[PDB]
Amino acid sequence: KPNPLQDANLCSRVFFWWLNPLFKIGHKRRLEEDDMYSVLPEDRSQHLGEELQGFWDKEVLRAENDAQKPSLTRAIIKCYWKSYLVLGIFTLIEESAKVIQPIFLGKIINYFENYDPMDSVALNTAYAYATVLTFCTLILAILHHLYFYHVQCAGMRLRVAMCHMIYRKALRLSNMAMGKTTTGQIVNLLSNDVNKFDQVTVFLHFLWAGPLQAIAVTALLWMEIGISCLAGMAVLIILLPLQSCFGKLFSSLRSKTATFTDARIRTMNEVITGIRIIKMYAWEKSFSNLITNLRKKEISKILRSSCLRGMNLASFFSASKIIVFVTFTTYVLLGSVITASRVFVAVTLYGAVRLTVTLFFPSAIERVSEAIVSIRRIQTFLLLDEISQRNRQLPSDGKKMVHVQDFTAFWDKASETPTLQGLSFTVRPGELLAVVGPVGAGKSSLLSAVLGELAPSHGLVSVHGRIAYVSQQPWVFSGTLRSNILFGKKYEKERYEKVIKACALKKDLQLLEDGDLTVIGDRGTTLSGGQKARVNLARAVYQDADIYLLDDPLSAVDAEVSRHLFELCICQILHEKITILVTHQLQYLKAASQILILKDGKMVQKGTYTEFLKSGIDFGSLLKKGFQAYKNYFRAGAHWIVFIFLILLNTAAQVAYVLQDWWLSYWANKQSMLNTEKLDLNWYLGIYSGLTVATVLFGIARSLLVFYVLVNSSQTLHNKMFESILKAPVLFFDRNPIGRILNRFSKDIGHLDDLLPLTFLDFIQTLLQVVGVVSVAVAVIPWIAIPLVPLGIIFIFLRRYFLETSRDVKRLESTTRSPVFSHLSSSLQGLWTIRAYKAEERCQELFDAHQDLHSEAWFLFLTTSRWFAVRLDAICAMFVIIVAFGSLILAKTLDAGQVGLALSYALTLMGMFQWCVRQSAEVENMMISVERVIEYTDLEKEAPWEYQKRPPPAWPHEGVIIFDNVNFMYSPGGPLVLKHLTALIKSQEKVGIVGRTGAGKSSLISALFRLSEPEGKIWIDKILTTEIGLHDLRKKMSIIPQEPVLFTGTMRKNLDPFNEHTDEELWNALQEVQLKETIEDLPGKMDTELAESGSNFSVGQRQLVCLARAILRKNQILIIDQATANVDPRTDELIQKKIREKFAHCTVLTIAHRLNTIIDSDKIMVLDSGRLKEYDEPYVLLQNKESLFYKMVQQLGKAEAAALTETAKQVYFKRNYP
Ligand SMILES: CS(=O)(=O)CCNCc1ccc(-c2ccc3ncnc(Nc4ccc(OCc5cccc(F)c5)c(Cl)c4)c3c2)o1
């Protein structure tokens, strides 16, 4: 894939003529990672990184010699200034041309003021001036794009070199350095700190060419107009602090909103995650109250910030008019006269200097400050401490030997007890050493000292030969399983097959689609813990080392696989290699030649397994311790009459803007046509002031109305969408993930509230200004309407052609960016394993390859943008040339004022055209959020909360339950769960639910709660459930779920969202559940805040709270789940006795994944794959051996089965025969 930029001329490199094949391919089909162009050798990551590293090392050596801190800024300056001279040269030329061209504009107008048809030398001079103007515009329009591309490429090169240097440092941190630093800070500084280097360079040169341009413009204005230019210059200067101060308030009003936004998002997350609970207990009204209040509070600050932004944009719109008006008011009031030559040069000079002073200089200042901060951060990181390089080893005979003597290290220098106390032992090839003792107190520290991971404070460690190390926690790096096993070294088929067979990885390969070539990312999402541990072992074996180190290799795998591995892959293969093993299982100590015991880092006893057996010490004992989108977006804001009024306001603002300059032209013509007599100053100045005031007011009004209307549309959309999602059936929440649901509330509404209206208003502003420029040009010279049609057609086709590939490249440079961060993070996590083997240059090369692959797409991202901009500027320059030459061709009709107005507007079209196109693309891109929000606004809905037939307030008066031909399915058309359930449940009786796992257990509860619409009839108190509203059905029957959830809020809110109970009743419930004492000790009495999901409360406390809530509700029908699985048996007995003694007079159903505690129920419902088999007294079912209940009881055993039978018999005798 050769780079076409390597074989390009200059007339092809200034027009970007080599990108045509790529654009053609992108138009024909979609582009992939094969289609991108490989980078040039001078842009490879290794070269740039090595260059900057050499310069930085020279600088740090010089600073060390000088006894002073180093300077990354000095290093980058000394590396890049000699290549940044040339771009400064060209930007100087460009600024000179920008300042120069209005002088020739003035010369053309000056010719036109004294038109004489008979003269021809004047016509020739005017043609020459027009040609010079065309040359200046072509310089501004064509070469500037190659200059800009090189300016951007310089920053990209700096960033790539920085990334290489940062990772090279990251691969060699020391232990304390890794401890003090964090795995998140490094990726933070590689994702949000080294990305300011793409933007510091683009606006870098405008720190010295800004004031120079302002000085040149002020001198030119003084030369032409006179003292009056200081009024315009003063307004332009005053515009700087005002704009700066209009940002320090927006920052405050934007950081005030984030609190409400985050609170709303967190509450939304709670609602979405615990949706089943809210729907079951009917708390959606309270949750809607909370969410609505938060949304209103946030929208207040959004409205304030939007009004501020609108006022700022109106100021930007009207600043030029204010400057021109005040300048010329002073110019005329000082006793001078107006001629069309000077006014329309002052206008152009003011436009240029105002743009530069308003935008580019503050942008450059901000970007330079941010880049300075980022350089400081990267320098502070780079100055971290590292390990000392492995020095020249002691001269030995080359034998593979392991020895440690008098070792004593310190993980923390401020700690008291050293990690190791005077260890002294050696091991040789063919010997298997083992280490046992406590639950792991200083277990891996021996391996750390052996590998050099621990700094030896005293003693000596002699290790010779290749080493293989297995981490306690297995680590897998992003790539492929084959590449993970290879670890960068060569691949041999026979060796790989032998390792795979000896590692029992055949089944693991079979379970994967690609076998040994499966692509595995971070954290082993496509694998399992045992598989990645086996991967680690396979890596260690395949590395073919001399010394082998193991640490907890078989704790995360099963028994047979672990035994087979430890036998075949160790006792046979490694019998000729040094081995040191740390294990927790004593069954592997039989094959261990040597066994050592360590307690608290102290040498205790070492020897053979037989000797330790004779010693009488037990190791086990020692181990104990489109368009409709736009229509719907606009309609929700306000009616169509406001749309008409907005159109009128836009047109009035633009018309007044243009009419001010037209009035200046009219004044100039009227003054020129004269004779002393004097023009009436009052009339002209009054009309001028009126037009200026109209421009300002209409601009402000248009901005405010657009902002308010779009913000109101966003608010209405959000309210409708939240009310729609709150009523969706649980099938929707089952089909969608929680993150996806919360995304459309966090990011999409985040766009709609604060970015879409501003982008839309800016686009409308610029489009109207372009339309005004073209309209003035057409009105002055009516024949310009002929080529504008070809220009528009060409522009439309060009926009389609470019955007058919720009979006593809924008996604290509984004899907190839994240692997850099992924590799950095993964290599940081597995740093110890990586450094254990001598293979770190391999990881460095892989990282550099990834960085090259990303620069491969960044290059396309730059060059395609330049390719589009070149053609756009060619079109705009063609328009300017047409105007400037037609004005001279048709000179027999026009006059000085008209020509000056047309020419000045044609000159100002520069830059404005491109900004309009870019903003249109941005708006079209951002409308997808509106599309998604509107899509969520029209979701499904469930049955109405309230029905026409309101129930009498005695509906659960007795508690009769009838199931008649009840069939339930979670999804329409899916497999059936219940088949013809027919049963009757009487009042006050306790009914238990039993069955096998997956046999439709937790389905009758959902059928009773009408979570999904059932098939059949269910009668409660001789009333059908489907004839009553859901809020009249779910409200007054209670359920205790598997795991209770506590929502963030007061305890009063948690136990009574509707505030239907008083303080005395709440305290009575708390003391009846024995939680009153536990509650009345917080700083708050009973309104203390709670963490998410009760993070500070125990599971028993959650069940206690649920029981208290049920008692407070006081429902006649109650259904409990298994509740307890691992809770303290004391708490289990407490809740059992409370359930027995509190709900005697209320119907109780008991579903459970449990036993014995469900033995006292009056009747047992037996479910076989959703079929109701047995429904009768437990004793009667136990009497028959063929009954499934008896077999399920016998599945436990014989003593427990006998106890259960006795309990059932006693319950039957006491109940049925009192
Ligand atoms: C009456 S006026 O002086 O305002 C007319 C000219 N400006 C019109 C206008 C309205 C809004 C903007 C605008 C808003 C935001 C922007 N953000 C970035 N860059 C902008 N423009 C810009 C213009 C010229 C530049 O110099 C290089 C150049 C030279 C010739 C042609 C080009 F396309 C570019 C640069 Cl670097 C940026 C901008 C404008 O411009």
Ligand SMILES: Nc1ncnc2c1ncn2[C@@H]1O[C@H](COP(=O)(O)OP(=O)(O)OP(=O)(O)O)[C@@H](O)[C@H]1O
């Ligand atoms: N990754 C680590 N970073 C810093 N200190 C560590 C690390 N691993 C162990 N240590 C320290 O080494 C010493 C060994 O004690 P500890 O019992 O925690 O070791 P271990 O080998 O990780 O334990 P176990 O075998 O139970 O997993 C302690 O002082 C501990 O803080």
Ligand SMILES: Nc1ncnc2c1ncn2[C@@H]1O[C@H](COP(=O)(O)OP(=O)(O)OP(=O)(O)O)[C@@H](O)[C@H]1O
């Ligand atoms: N939300 C659901 N959507 C689709 N199928 C489901 C859903 N919940 C359960 N199932 C399926 O329905 C069958 C039985 O469901 P159920 O949850 O009642 O079984 P269980 O394991 O006996 O009960 P428990 O939830 O008490 O463990 C199983 O095949 C299960 O996979």
Ligand SMILES: [Mg+2]
């Ligand atoms: Mg350990």
Ligand SMILES: [Mg+2]
């Ligand atoms: Mg289940």
